[PDB]
Design a protein around this ligand. Structure first.
Ligand SMILES: *[C@@H]1O[C@H](CO)[C@@H](O[C@@H]2O[C@H](CO)[C@@H](O)[C@H](O)[C@H]2NC(C)=O)[C@H](O)[C@H]1NC(C)=O
Ligand SMILES: *[C@@H]1O[C@H](CO)[C@@H](O[C@@H]2O[C@H](CO)[C@@H](O)[C@H](O)[C@H]2NC(C)=O)[C@H](O)[C@H]1NC(C)=O
Ligand SMILES: *[C@@H]1O[C@H](CO)[C@@H](O[C@@H]2O[C@H](CO)[C@@H](O)[C@H](O)[C@H]2NC(C)=O)[C@H](O)[C@H]1NC(C)=O
Ligand SMILES: *[C@@H]1O[C@H](CO)[C@@H](O)[C@H](O)[C@H]1NC(C)=O
Ligand SMILES: *[C@@H]1O[C@H](CO)[C@@H](O)[C@H](O)[C@H]1NC(C)=O
Ligand SMILES: *[C@@H]1O[C@H](CO)[C@@H](O)[C@H](O)[C@H]1NC(C)=O
Ligand SMILES: *[C@@H]1O[C@H](CO)[C@@H](O)[C@H](O)[C@H]1NC(C)=O
Ligand SMILES: *[C@@H]1O[C@H](CO)[C@@H](O)[C@H](O)[C@H]1NC(C)=O
Ligand SMILES: *[C@@H]1O[C@H](CO)[C@@H](O)[C@H](O)[C@H]1NC(C)=O
Ligand SMILES: *[C@@H]1O[C@H](CO)[C@@H](O)[C@H](O)[C@H]1NC(C)=O
Ligand SMILES: *[C@@H]1O[C@H](CO)[C@@H](O)[C@H](O)[C@H]1NC(C)=O
Ligand SMILES: *[C@@H]1O[C@H](CO)[C@@H](O)[C@H](O)[C@H]1NC(C)=O
Ligand SMILES: *[C@@H]1O[C@H](CO)[C@@H](O)[C@H](O)[C@H]1NC(C)=O
Ligand SMILES: *[C@@H]1O[C@H](CO)[C@@H](O)[C@H](O)[C@H]1NC(C)=O
Ligand SMILES: *[C@@H]1O[C@H](CO)[C@@H](O)[C@H](O)[C@H]1NC(C)=O
Ligand SMILES: *[C@@H]1O[C@H](CO)[C@@H](O)[C@H](O)[C@H]1NC(C)=O
Ligand SMILES: *[C@@H]1O[C@H](CO)[C@@H](O)[C@H](O)[C@H]1NC(C)=O
Ligand SMILES: *[C@@H]1O[C@H](CO)[C@@H](O)[C@H](O)[C@H]1NC(C)=O
Ligand SMILES: *[C@@H]1O[C@H](CO)[C@@H](O)[C@H](O)[C@H]1NC(C)=O
Ligand SMILES: *[C@@H]1O[C@H](CO)[C@@H](O)[C@H](O)[C@H]1NC(C)=O
Lengths: 106, 141, 561, 121, 50, 50
């Protein structure tokens, strides 16, 4: 399979700051990357699909972009509802491997 | 915005000879066609539609349980599928039997609007090229 | 003391910029996938003025030319396959049996084609490779094409050739290409020997993974280039001095049958086996590869300190990603490049490495999904004669560094070549103080203010002035004309109807630059001066416009009465 | 407003068959891949498998040594069968909807996820 | 055509009460026909109130 | 070819004396295929008079 890694494994942030999460693929995946949000007691929610398109109803603040094996998710104007575990997933080859996950702390 | 009241000038306006209206018509038609171009064509769907009625300010006769035979992803294999259609999108065929077709598919390449395309109106400003100008009539009546 | 603003047009100054370049092909038709018609004929002799005293900063890893090449090659690939046959009526359930001999790699598949005649159903037999055929049931004989259920499969026209041709990229009017002429350049950093070229050297757009085939070689030593060298997961492009040679052969001889799809469209497929079923055995000279690995691990020990370096094969997985992939002869190879990276260096069998390879016809190129290409088979043996030109290495903990053959999207196959070139936007307008009142292109760019102010003529003369490529070129030319008219209107509103050098007579304030004329018109390049007065450019420009033309115009209006 | 609910036993001993059922509320099953995925504690999410439509082609994560079978039981319920379950298989199992079409939001992504059920061993 | 522009606007509220579900039927390789599914609730009519 | 241009214009008048009906047909899945129907009148030859 294609191994996916992301950085940092965890970071702390306050309300209003900008957060950047880098997802790195072991092999090129074109633009076929998705960004998911996970909260306790709730299933994962889709934030970004095809590495730059926001899903319907996602807040505008979430910005994600990249290509090849390199992608970055930038969350501007951090809100109290946006503290959650963010993960990146590929889409090229099956199984579509996920990633370790970055927990955003207060 | 840059707006400059022209003093001492009185200008004759005539909307019915306003080329901006026709230009906007061309703009809207071209936008519609451009938006619908990269979307699904429903040509493979236009088949003999054997359709019954749906039993429920109540409606009567408007929604129809409409079935047809479609090809699956293996081409040779066929699958029977169903969907609900309003009375207006369907046309009878073969006199008074239950066979129907989709209106206008006898002569038009039915295009599906992509669900991700929004039809919400957004204000559009028209701006003239440099060297041209737009005169606005401010008389209240 | 009594200094006045003077406007100079044609200044050798530039800033980093991103634009679309014109593709040029060697003068030397074949319908080659990257269309010759789109690209203009190359100039018979290129000009390479050897800019002296200019030390520009280059960076391969932030270079819009590479992304522009990726977009252009994708567009040309799609356009070349646009009018070819689309294999829509071939998703039919295939009854497949193993070919009686490799074992199981080629499958004898029967299927019912329903042509457009629509009064016959023709049972036909064809051979398909195992990689393109997937089961659809617990029945061991029923299969389908691998990617025809979620994609539209476009058959490549057999008349399209995939032979690499050198493609140049040439600057449009208003821009320049600065080439780094150093010999040990590390990709990212200052370049001490810079030239200006109208077009780049011949670039073969060879498509391959884990390894760069054909192209230019290093002049001094094996060059290892990476952006950071420690973050990991950043391609470590390796350029070599001496080229190893990948002789590759497909022994099997095949016959190509055609099956009608519609009036004037045919599906080209594999008829039957002629001769024995052998395997594609790519042969690399072990001794030469030994030498190359030595000349690479030495440099890697130099860069990563004296650690043990282990060359491992790529992580296991599907063949397309893991295995190297040629573009030779019109048949897509996938070669198990494991024997090449199986060594621990630290600090005997055979003399030739035989890499087995599998041929695949249904492919998904440019890491895209939902689109797929079918390459029709070639009659006869295919005998490649390629040249090892470069490697792509990626890193993965007892003091040992693990390097694997990796890579990325095809952009990294061109950063290995377009590492000595940069695109720069030229802004010919500048201002300087004077005492008055009312070589080749950029050859004096590194010269002082004095004696560069005498060559504005050539820079001013040579700076300015169908289909998808057509529309992009039209937008580019219109933008260039816009820029030119921007400069000309700025000169006109400054009262410089037609004067490369036009004195203004506006007073030279001492809050802009306090330096005297001797220290302003010598001891500095135009670059340092333009940077110096950058903040005041708007203010100065305003003063050249408002304070004079208006007043001079009013005065001349008042002179005839 | 398509919602997915997993159900099944919360404790299965080693080596029997683990059986889960995902029920689709709001809408009936349609031509999107329906996928079983899991998250073991301390591990990334791992795809288990998928089935297309109401009975049809399937695919399964190759690195499971064919221990997994997925099938559709009811027009709004599909199920996961995982054989020879071991202690390493403890995880939170999710059922999800994977889109095939680029004309809708969430192309090639798990647009719809269920709540998820924790299965231990 | 006679075009009438009013001093003050008239609010119009239109409701489609009948609750709907979307079913997608594959047409071809990656092409979907997005169409009617099951109807939830009773079958009332869509009305505009002025 | 010896191209010939004329001083005066000769007159050609041509008609087809038939009455027909456009019989739309629907052979497959797709837009309908138009074709001829029935000869309402007799079968007469189309002629060009000089
Ligand atoms: C439209 O007609 C279809 C049959 O063409 C109905 O599908 C049946 O629905 C019932 C509901 O209880 C199921 O039990 C059957 O298994 C379905 N049969 C099929 C698909 O062959 C459908 O219910 C009808 N829809 C409406 C709104 O009346
Ligand atoms: C700087 O680069 C220039 C251009 O590449 C070099 O000039 C070339 O030198 C070679 C030496 O064999 C000549 O054959 C070429 O004709 C020269 N080219 C041009 C355009 O003049 C120059 O040698 C380099 N200087 C260094 C490294 O000091
Ligand atoms: C692929 O299979 C077909 C049918 O299974 C083979 O076609 C037969 O080939 C034999 C060879 O002796 C002929 O005698 C038969 O007449 C052929 N049958 C038909 C129906 O054409 C074909 O040879 C197979 N190809 C390979 C390479 O094994
Ligand atoms: C077409 O659908 C009708 C539904 O009444 C069915 O009788 C018939 O068998 C179907 N034909 C095929 C070829 O599947
Ligand atoms: C269609 O293919 C099937 C495969 O089982 C075969 O039995 C049948 O004869 C074929 N039909 C025709 C008309 O060739
Ligand atoms: C290289 O990556 C490391 C990762 O920790 C980072 O700290 C460092 O700043 C990077 N260096 C450069 C020059 O980008
Ligand atoms: C293909 O034909 C050539 C004809 O010279 C022959 O040398 C070669 O061996 C053939 N291939 C095989 C696999 O027999
Ligand atoms: C590759 O090496 C093998 C070793 O047996 C030999 O048979 C074969 O002819 C070689 N091929 C080429 C193209 O040199
Ligand atoms: C590769 O082919 C060339 C063709 O000229 C030949 O000279 C050379 O010996 C071959 N290399 C190997 C390693 O067999
Ligand atoms: C890396 O190479 C070592 C031997 O040097 C081997 O034991 C190990 O399995 C390799 N790792 C892989 C292929 O992941
Ligand atoms: C390459 O060959 C080796 C030989 O041991 C094998 O283990 C490996 O799986 C092969 N690689 C691929 C990608 O098939
Ligand atoms: C790698 O080298 C070792 C030691 O020589 C050998 O046993 C092993 O087979 C090699 N790997 C392959 C794939 O040939
Ligand atoms: C060079 O290749 C030989 C066989 O030709 C092999 O024994 C040797 O180990 C290789 N060299 C090194 C430094 O590993
Ligand atoms: C490949 O290398 C050989 C080494 O002699 C050289 O003659 C030949 O020109 C090279 N081919 C290319 C395309 O660079
Ligand atoms: C010439 O420029 C250099 C670079 O800034 C500076 O050190 C030097 O003093 C300048 N000369 C004079 C005379 O100011
Ligand atoms: C000009 O602006 C730049 C913006 O970065 C600033 O650093 C610099 O100090 C300014 N210089 C002046 C006002 O001389
Ligand atoms: C429409 O159906 C959904 C199904 O979840 C339900 O939540 C909603 O309340 C329904 N509409 C009304 C008006 O009750
Ligand atoms: C619209 O008018 C009808 C009249 O019967 C009423 O029942 C309904 O509540 C009204 N709807 C709204 C949205 O005001
Ligand atoms: C041709 O037939 C049509 C049929 O509707 C009829 O109305 C019409 O009068 C006929 N024309 C002539 C010239 O006979
Ligand atoms: C052509 O000439 C014939 C001679 O019989 C006559 O009957 C017919 O009406 C003429 N047609 C026209 C269109 O004048």
């Amino acid at each position: 399979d294609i191994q996916m890694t992301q950085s940092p494994s965890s970071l702390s942030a306050s309300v209003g700051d900008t957060v950047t999460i880098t997802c790195q693929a072991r092999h090129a995946v074109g633009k076929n990357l998705n960004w998911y949000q996970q909260k306790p007691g709730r299933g994962p929610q889709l934030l970004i699909y095809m590495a730059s398109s926001r899903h319907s109803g996602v807040p505008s603040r979430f910005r994600g972009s990249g290509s090849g094996r390199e992608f970055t998710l930038t969350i501007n104007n951090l809100q109290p509802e946006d503290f959650a575990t963010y993960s990146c997933q590929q889409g090229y080859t099956y199984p579509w491997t996920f990633g370790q996950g970055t927990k955003v702390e207060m | 915005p840059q707006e400059v009241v022209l003093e001492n000038v009185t200008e004759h306006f005539n909307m019915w000879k306003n080329n901006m209206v026709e230009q906007m018509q061309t703009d809207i038609i071209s936008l519609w066609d451009q938006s619908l171009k990269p979307c699904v064509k429903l040509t493979p769907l236009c088949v003999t539609l054997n359709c019954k009625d749906v039993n429920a300010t109540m409606e009567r006769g408007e929604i129809k349980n409409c079935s047809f035979n479609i090809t699956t992803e293996l081409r040779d294999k066929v699958q029977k599928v169903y969907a609900l259609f309003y009375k207006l999108d369907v046309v009878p065929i073969d006199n008074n039997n239950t066979s129907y077709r989709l209106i206008s598919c006898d002569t038009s390449v039915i295009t599906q609007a992509c669900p991700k395309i929004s039809f919400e109106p957004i204000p559009i400003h028209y701006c003239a090229p440099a060297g041209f100008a737009i005169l606005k009539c401010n008389d209240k009546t | 003391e009594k200094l006045w603003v003077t406007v100079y047009y044609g200044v050798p100054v530039w800033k980093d910029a991103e634009t679309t370049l014109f593709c040029a092909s060697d003068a030397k038709e074949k319908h080659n996938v990257w269309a010759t018609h789109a690209c203009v004929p190359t100039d018979p002799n290129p000009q390479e003025v050897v800019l002296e005293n200019v030390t520009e900063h280059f960076n391969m890893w932030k270079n819009n030319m590479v992304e522009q090449m990726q977009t252009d090659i994708i567009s040309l690939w799609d356009q070349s396959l646009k009018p070819c046959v689309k294999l829509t009526p071939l998703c039919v359930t295939l009854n497949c049996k193993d070919v009686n001999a490799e074992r199981g790699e080629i499958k004898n598949c029967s299927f019912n084609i329903t042509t457009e005649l629509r009064d016959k159903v023709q049972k036909v037999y064809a051979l398909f490779y195992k990689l393109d055929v997937v089961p659809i049931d617990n029945n061991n004989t029923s299969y389908r094409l691998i990617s025809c259920d979620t994609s539209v499969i476009t058959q490549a026209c057999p008349k399209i050739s995939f032979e690499p041709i050198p493609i140049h990229y040439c600057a449009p009017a208003g821009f320049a290409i600065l080439k780094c002429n150093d010999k040990t350049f590390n990709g990212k950093g200052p370049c001490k020997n810079v030239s200006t070229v109208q077009c780049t050297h011949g670039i073969r757009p060879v498509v391959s993974t884990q390894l760069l085939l054909n192209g230019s070689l290093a002049e001094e030593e094996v060059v290892i280039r990476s952006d950071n060298f420690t973050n990991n997961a950043k391609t470590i492009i390796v350029q070599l001095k001496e080229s190893v040679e990948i002789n590759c052969t497909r022994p099997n001889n095949y016959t190509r049958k055609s099956i009608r799809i519609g009036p004037g469209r045919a599906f080209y497929t594999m008829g039957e086996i002629i001769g024995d079923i052998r395997q594609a055995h790519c042969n690399i000279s072990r001794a030469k590869w030994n030498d190359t690995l030595k000349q690479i691990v030495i440099k890697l020990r130099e860069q990563f300190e004296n650690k043990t370096i282990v060359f491992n094969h790529s992580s296991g997985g599907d063949p397309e990603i893991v295995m190297h992939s040629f573009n030779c002869g019109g048949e897509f190879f996938y070669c198990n490049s494991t024997q090449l990276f199986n060594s621990t260096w630290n600090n005997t069998e055979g003399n030739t490495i035989t890499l087995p390879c599998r041929i695949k016809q249904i492919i998904n190129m440019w890491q895209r999904v939902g689109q797929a290409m079918y390459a029709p088979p070639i009659r006869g043996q295919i005998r490649c004669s390629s040249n090892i030109t470069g490697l792509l290495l990626t890193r993965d903990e007892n003091g040992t560094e693990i390097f694997r053959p990796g890579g990325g999207d095809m952009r990294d196959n061109w950063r290995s070549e377009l590492y000595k070139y940069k695109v720069v936007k030229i802004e010919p307008l500048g201002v300087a103080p004077t005492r008055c009142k009312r070589r080749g292109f950029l050859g004096a760019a590194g010269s002082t203010m004095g004696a560069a102010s005498m060559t504005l003529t050539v820079q001013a003369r040579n700076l300015l002035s169908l289909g998808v490529w057509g529309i992009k070129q039209l937008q580019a030319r219109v933008l260039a004309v816009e820029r030119y008219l921007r400069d000309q209107q700025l000169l006109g509103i400054w009262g410089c109807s037609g004067k490369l050098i036009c004195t203004t007579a506006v007073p030279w304030n001492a809050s802009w630059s306090n330096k005297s004329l001797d220290r302003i018109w010598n001891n500095m390049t135009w670059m340092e001066w333009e940077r110096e007065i950058d903040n005041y450019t708007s203010e100065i420009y305003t003063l050249i416009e408002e304070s004079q033309n208006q007043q001079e115009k009013n005065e001349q209006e008042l002179l005839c009465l | 407003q398509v919602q997915l609910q997993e159900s099944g036993p919360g404790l299965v001993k080693p080596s029997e068959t683990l059986s889960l059922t995902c029920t689709v509320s709001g809408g009936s099953i349609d031509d999107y891949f329906w996928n079983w995925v899991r998250q073991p504690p301390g591990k990334p999410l791992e795809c288990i498998g998928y089935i297309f439509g109401r009975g049809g082609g399937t695919k399964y994560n190759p690195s499971l040594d064919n221990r997994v079978t997925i099938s559709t039981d009811t027009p709004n319920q599909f199920s996961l069968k995982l054989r020879s379950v071991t202690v390493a298989d403890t995880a939170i199992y999710y059922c999800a909807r994977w889109n095939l079409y680029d004309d809708d939001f969430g192309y090639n992504s798990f647009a719809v996820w269920g709540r998820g059920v924790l299965v231990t061993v």
